[PDB]
Each structure stands twice: as structure tokens, then as C-alpha cells.
Symmetry: none
Subunit: 294 residues, 4 copies
């Protein structure tokens, strides 16, 4: 049904201020589970989608958007039509490839060394939950069609944090190396919006951890005193940390750092067979991840 969910939505059309995106023609791909979708913007040709429906478990599904009409390059890129399309894809695909040849902004940005995720195009995928990025710029006759941005949704909450933390490093490395105030300004603006989403995740991770610890030490009577102190202190540590994110304070990451340490200490020591200790150590570990990109 995965295919028809696609075929049906594309046949129906995707509306936008820049025009409606409709399916032009479809064709069977290289393999049995591969298909090619040609799209139009209004009446004019837009781009092609190369899709893979997947074959569990060795083959992950993915989508490749390419063959963008150069006449529409200044219209499509950075438009709602662009957003609406990705909005659609993100609902079906965890892995995505985009040809950025016709995107002068992104190409220029990538050439000047911006991280793939903080590029104009990459930013649009980031907003939709894609955390892992790879910039292919090297074909050199070794791999055909070598100008694409690869983006994937995180495997786990751990992976999501791993990626954002890494992205933090690439960002700071780029800033110190860049000499373009206009470029740097755009990148920082994009990055800031990212921070907001990250801090708000710590907030909720903190609370879902706080309530979990409270419920633990309250109802679970057959526990140590070292354990009533672990879950106790952790609950307040997350409380302090949550307090700093709420006001979005600059000293927040220092606190999350401490809180993460004893949230980890709490999870390792209080984890057990009970449902109470299952969600206790669990919600602790969900918070520890939240702090990593800080």
C-alpha cells in the first residue's frame, strides 16, 4: 500500500502558491521496487523523483529528487512548493537525496564550506527532522551523479543527539573559518532556530524524567537508600536544569552537563525489572541524550 499512498497523493496533486505540483508520467526503475516519477509545476515540467519502496530488512527506503528544470530554478528553490513537497516526502522516507546543481544559493554556500545541514536547502530538511548529512561533491568519474545532499532521520534518540552535537562542532568550526558577515549572519539565524528546538526538547525530557523519578521513589518501596537519594537528587537536578531552559539562560548548558552525569548515574543504578524502574532509567536516559548537543 506504500506505493499507492504515494501514487494517489501525487495524482491528487500538491497545491502551493507557486502552482500545483502534479504527476506527469511514471515508469518502472532499475529494480523491482524502484520507480521514476516525473513532476510538473502547473503545466511546466519540474523535476523527477526516483523512489525506493524498501525491502526489509537489508534495504532501506529512500527518495531522490533530481533533474530540476533550470528555467524554474529561481522560482522553485526557497518556495512553499519546495516546502510542501518535502513535507510530503518526510512522511514516507527516512532517507533523502537532492540534486543541488540548480540551487545557486546552496551550491555557493556548500562551496564556501557551510555544513550541509545549515545550507539553505539542507536547512529545509533539518526542519523536518532529518539529522544526518553528507555532501557529495566528488564524482570525479568514480560515482555517477555526484552532486547531491544526503539526509537521514535519526535511528534513535541517541543518534539524533549524536548528530546535533556533531553539527554544533561543524557550525563553530565554520564560523571561525568564515570571513563573510552576510553568509555568517544567515547561517547563525538558521542555527539559532535549531537551538530553540533543542532547548525545548531538554525541557520536556527533563520533566518526563522528573515525573518518572518522583513516581519511582514514591511508589517503589523495595529500593535502597542510595537509590532513594539517586532518584531524589536527579529529580531536582532536572528541575534546576529545566528552570534555566525556560528562561533560555546562557549558563544552561553548564547545568545540563552536571544533571546529565547524575541522570546517567541514576539510570544505571536504579534500572531493574519493575515497570517503575523501566521507565525511570528510561526517562533518565532520554534526558541525558537531550543535553548532548549542548
Amino acid at each position: 500500500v506504500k506505493y499507492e499512498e504515494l501514487l494517489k497523493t501525487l495524482e491528487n496533486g500538491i497545491n502551493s502558491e507557486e502552482g500545483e505540483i502534479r504527476l506527469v508520467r511514471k515508469s518502472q526503475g532499475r529494480f523491482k521496487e524502484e520507480f521514476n516519477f516525473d513532476l510538473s509545476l502547473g503545466s511546466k515540467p519540474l523535476l523527477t523523483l526516483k523512489v525506493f519502496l524498501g525491502r526489509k530488512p537489508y534495504w532501506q527506503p529512500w527518495v531522490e529528487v533530481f533533474g530540476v528544470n533550470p528555467n524554474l530554478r529561481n522560482v522553485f528553490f526557497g518556495s512553499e512548493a519546495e516546502r510542501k513537497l518535502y513535507e510530503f516526502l518526510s512522511e514516507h522516507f527516512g532517507r533523502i537525496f537532492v540534486e543541488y546543481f540548480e540551487d545557486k544559493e546552496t551550491t555557493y554556500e556548500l562551496q564556501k564550506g557551510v555544513p550541509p545541514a545549515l545550507s539553505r536547502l539542507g536547512f529545509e530538511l533539518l526542519k523536518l527532522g532529518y539529522t544526518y548529512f553528507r555532501d557529495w561533491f566528488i564524482p570525479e568519474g568514480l560515482m555517477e551523479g555526484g552532486h547531491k545532499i544526503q539526509a537521514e532521520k535519526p535511528k534513535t534518540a541517541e543518534a539524533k543527539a549524536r548528530h546535533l552535537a556533531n553539527l554544533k562542532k561543524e557550525f563553530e568550526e565554520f564560523i571561525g573559518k568564515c570571513e563573510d558577515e552576510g553568509l555568517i549572519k544567515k547561517v547563525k539565524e538558521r542555527y539559532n532556530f535549531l537551538e530553540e528546538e533543542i532547548y525545548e526538547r531538554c525541557r520536556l525530557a527533563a520533566h518526563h524524567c522528573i515525573h518518572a523519578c518522583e513516581r519511582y521513589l514514591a511508589l517503589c518501596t523495595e529500593s535502597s537508600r542510595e537509590q532513594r537519594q539517586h532518584a531524589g537528587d536527579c529529580a531536582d537536578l532536572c528541575r534546576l536544569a529545566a528552570l534555566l531552559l525556560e528562561r533560555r539562560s546562557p549558563w544552561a548548558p553548564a547545568a545540563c552537563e552536571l544533571a546529565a552525569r547524575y541522570a546517567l548515574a541514576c539510570a544505571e543504578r536504579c534500572d531493574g525489572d519493575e515497570p517503575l524502574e523501566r521507565e525511570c532509567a528510561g526517562a533518565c536516559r532520554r534526558f541525558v541524550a537531550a543535553c548532548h548537543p549542548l
Copy 2:
């Protein structure tokens, strides 16, 4: 006037449940800034005080208590009379010498290898802020009554922290070396109380620091938002730390360490001419000091 503050208090008398301590006779000692004070307990003779008023800068002031009445040895040592006296002396002298010949408990304890500060007699001085200790058992030739405990107040917070850390070392070493459970129990009880007083000082320094920040950001309207963020976050840092000290948690000093960092950062940045900033930066620094002995 330093001498007359003394003479006036002893002439008036110092009352206690075991009797009133009054001055019997005073006499000029070997040197000009040296005097001998004979004291009575009720009507019976108690001991003699050898005092040195000091002569800045080469001579630190000190007091020597000796000639303890052996018949009253079991009534005085460990009594409020003993406490009230030291309480009095600690207000005037940074350095003190005490003959422990007539103190059987202290004597036995010192013989069994207990740290001077953790002896029955030594503990009472420790309570009053004396941190540096020396046990004389050798009259070393030119010292009369070569069975005395020497105690000095710390030069600095570093010196105070230095001394307590060293005592921590002698304590653990003693615990492993002694084979008397009754002895070890008494000592441990004393040491625990030492931990308490430091924490109790942190608890209170913490509150008086919070109130300083609370009143500052509240009433001081003409300040930055960076200062509003400084005093704000600090107030909560000290809040979190206070909670851990209150429950006497093992993770308390870890919190105190962090809170101390941004309390100092707050003090340096928010200090000013105003009474609000005078006490804000002030009370912060009092807490920072309080945390040092951890």
C-alpha cells in the same frame, strides 16, 4: 584597651552550671606584654592563664591555660565551664595552648594515636574555629609544662581548607590503625559533627546569598539583563545546592562547586556602589568561601 576588655570580663565573672569563674590574682609575667591570671571555680582554685596581648607585626597574640586544679579535673574537663571559657578566649586569641595533664580522657586518646583536633579537649577548640593543631609531649627544653595542645585559627580559606583536608587524612589513617570500637565510635561521632558544621555554614551562606540576589534583581531596576541573568541564575543555583545540603546528600558538594563558580561570576559582575549590589556581591562571596572546605 585590648587588656581591659579581658580584665573587665574576668572581674565580672563568667557563670556556668559547674560554678562561676572569677579572677583571683593577676601578676606581671616574664615580659612586658606577658601576664599571669589565676582563676577560681566558685570559691575553689581552678587554673592559671598565661596571656600575650601581642605586638604587631612580629608577635602574634596567644593564651596559655595551665595549672589546672587536679581535684576539679573531673568536674571541669568536659563541662560548660570549660566551654564558656574557651568561647570567651576564642574572641581574643588566634593561638592557644592547653595543658592536658589533668585531662585523663584527652591524655589516653592522644596516647592511642588520635589526631589532636579529634581529642576530647581538641574537639572543643576545633568547634571554635581553631584548625591548626600541634601536640606537645616533649617539653623540648625551653618550654615549661611540656604536655600541651597548641591550636591556631587559619590564616586564609586556603589554609583552612588545607588544614581540614589534612585532618581528613589523619582521621582515616587513625580509623584503620585503632582496635578500640568504643574509641572509634566517639571519634567518628566528633568527625561527623565537623562535617555538619561546615555544611550548616554552607546552608546558611547559601540562603543569605539567595536573598541578596533576589532583592537585587527585584529592587535594583537600573541594571543590565546580563546582570538580571547573573543574579537570577545564581539564585537558583544556590537554591539547588541548598536543597542537597538540606537533605545532606552525597552529591551536595558537586552542586556547591558549580554554584560557587557563577556566584563568583555574579559577584564580580554585579558589584557596585549601591547597597543592593554591595550586599549582593558580598553575600555571594560569603557562600563561595563557605564551599571551599568541601
Copy 3:
């Protein structure tokens, strides 16, 4: 040519004490980059290889070994024939799947909760650089033979260190949970050897780094004294670290941590166009990587 490197080696045969492995028949699999290889042991049937040559960038290459001859199950599993084969495959595939149905030892071990990497079968893959493991016991619907071990080589040194750290966690957790001393002994023996190989890599990376610095400061005459101090001190840092690894000391990684810092500092500062500086900075960075898994 990637396929023919394979076909040529299997046609030639791979010899071992338990017999020679030769290609019986090859056949086109479900997809174009998919093939099935039937193998014999001496003259008797052994197993089938399902291989994927890969299709950059969306498809990682992988190999699936299955259809193990049950009559040879006790001769093959744990033999040089098994080792020689994996040794061969590890040169061509970063991702591998192995059916452990006919491997009673591995089967029993996996059932008793041992980490996949630390199973009899899994350990042999671990030896070859495979760090990421997944135990399939659920055929999960669209997977034939749903009793397989999946192993992947690390993406990066961070990923490698990440995986080993996680395995360290599963290991200690398993030790506390199992009640079979014979089982625990085997596992611990395996894990210790893992520690060994990492250290043995550090030992050798350390020497090849020392020689690089030794030859640099010696032969490279046109260099700074800061560079003479860089390569000089580094050579001795690695010397000290090597001594601790050699005696297999518990304080070895502490030394490796420091030496790694100024080996990187040396590499960054002494790297240049010359062959002496090309290998100097080079061999330094190889040691730095070697220390990461600690």
C-alpha cells in the same frame, strides 16, 4: 572488477587444514547486483554465499553466508576454514550476515544472553574489525532464515569507540546476570583478548610514531626549535606510554591520553611538504586514533 576479484579467489580455492573451499556453482540472485555462491569443503557441500557488490551511494555492499551443511557443522564452526573464509570476506565487505543455526555453541550462547560480539561466532568477526552487531532471532517477516548475526565495520573512530564502549556495558551486565562459570570464563577470555588487540595496536602505532619523530628532528635540518621541541617531547611521551602498554599497566591509558594530545599538537605543527614531515605528522595521527578506543 570488484566481482572478479571475488570469482578469481573462490575459483582458485581457499586452503585450510579442514579442507579446501572451492566454488561449486554461481547463480543470479533476485537483483542485478545480487549473486548466489555455492561452496564445497573438499568434495562435500559446505554453504551458500549471498553477496551484494554495492551500488554507491545508496547501497552499502554486504555478504550473507547461509545454507551451512548440517553434517559438517561440528567440523567447520571454530575451524581455520571458518577463519580463512571470514579473513577473505572482511577484505571486501563492511557488512556481513551469518546464519548460526548450525552453530550450536553460538546458539546456546546467544540464548543465555551473551552479547552477539562476544559469542563464539561473533568473536571471530569482532577479531576482523567488525564492531557493530545485531542478533536476528525474528525473521521479521521479509527476511529468509531469521536466525542470523549482522556485523558492520565502524563508520569512524568515534563510531568504533562508541561501539566498544557499548559492548563494555553489555559485557559487565552479562557477567552479573549469568550463573555459568564455564560460560563466564570463556567470555572473559575473549574480552581480555579484545583489550589486548587494542593495546597491541597502541603499542605498534606508538613505535611507528616515535620513529617518525626521531627521523624528523634528526634528518630534517630546516625546522624551528619549537618543532624540534614538538617532535622531541612527543617522541618521549610516546616512549613513556609505550612502556606502560608493554608491561600492560592499568595507568597506561592515562599516559596515552596525554601523549595523544601533544602528538596531535606535533602533527598539526610539523606537517609539511617534505617526506619527513609527511610521515611524521602521519604516524602521529595513527597513534592518536589508536588511543581513542581507550
Copy 4:
């Protein structure tokens, strides 16, 4: 005899290029053990020495040089006559006071905030082993004769290191705060000479520790394997550290830092009743001190 050693040497005279220092008149001081010595330079009056021979244990001996003839101020200060005099005093007194009123250089330097020890005058005392400094500049009618530099020889090897480490801090604090290149240059030149003496002390402390550890693990057979590894590794750690001081490398303090940690770990764990473990832990602790000012 302590007095006559003085009286005899002063009567004999102290020769210098700037003239001979001879005793003019002597007089009994404030107390029984106090004396005043008036000195001449050639035939012209020089200064007065106020000396205290000591009275163990409560009274430490000290010497105060004051009443310097202003006509000779540019001749005496910074002369060999000045050095020879102090050379003499340092042989008898652990505590010294010097009026710096007639020393324009030192006064100006102290006024501009240089540490007492790194002043022109203070430097001369530092060379002779005096480590603790206090600058009295505040009389304000509270203490008479309030313009003196106080210098003391260290109580222990621990104290010596404590002082130098503190001096390192005052030095760096002053440098960043000062805006006089001529002044800063002089201070650094003085400080550098200090570093040399400090590094050479680590060298010998390292070796006296190295040989001590070798002798320990070699002859002491009834020791743990954790103990053969402690004393073993420490011996090599000090070796590496010693290596860096010998060439006087910039990365030296980083190494001493590590070595000090496991020299302390070695002393605590290997210390015992035996003469071998007495000097082992001992020589370890002598080295740990050496690293502190680094």
C-alpha cells in the same frame, strides 16, 4: 652562643667593594632577648639592626634592618655590601624585616603593584631561600613603623612549594595588569631566574624518587602486585618528567602534573613501617611538592 656568633662576626667586620661594614655601637632592647646593632659603612653610618635571638618554642627569632642613612641610599641598595649583609643574616634568621623607604626602586615597584618577592629588594631575599612575603604599607596610625617587607624561610618542603605556587599566581596577575614594558621586563627577568631554581629542584626530587622506587620494588619482596606496579610506573613517570626538565621544555608542567598524581598515589599506597617504604613514600612526596609551583 647564638648572640656571640653575631657579635663576633660584626666586630670582625664584613668586607665589600662598597666598603667594610663594621659595628658602631650595641644596646639592650625592649626585652631581655632583644638587642640593637648600629652599623657603619666604612666610616659613615649605615643602618640599624634590631635582633631577637629567640626563645623556643613560642618565640621565633627574627632580624629587622632599618634606619638606613639616606645619603647612602643610592650606594647601598643594589650593592654587594647589601648582598653580603643578607648572606650573613640568612645564616642566622628564618624571619626578616627590611625598611624600604630609602629604596626608590623597590618603593616605586611596590607602589605599582609588583609582588613583594619580585621587587628589587625582595628578589635579593628570595635568592637566599626566603619564600613567604608580606608587604606592610599600611601604618595609618594603627601600627608604628609600617613600611617594611617581611620575608620568611619555608617551614617545610610543602610550605616552600605552597609559597612558590602562590607567587606564580601573583606574578601572572601582575603581568596582565601592568602596562610598563620596562617594569615588566625586569620582573620577568627576575621571575625566570626563579623558574630555573624550581625546575632543577624537580630534577633532583624526581631522581631521589626514582632511585627510591627502584630500591623499593627490587628489595622489598613482601609487597603487592598493585604495589610493584605503583612504584614501577611512578619510577618511569618521574623519568619522563625528569627528561623534560633537563631540556627545559615548555610541555614539562603538563607531565609533572600527571607524574605528581601517581607519585601521590604511590606514596599513600606503598607507605609502611619498613625503612624501604618509609623513604619510598617519602621521596615520592618530596617530588609531588616540587611540581606544585608548575
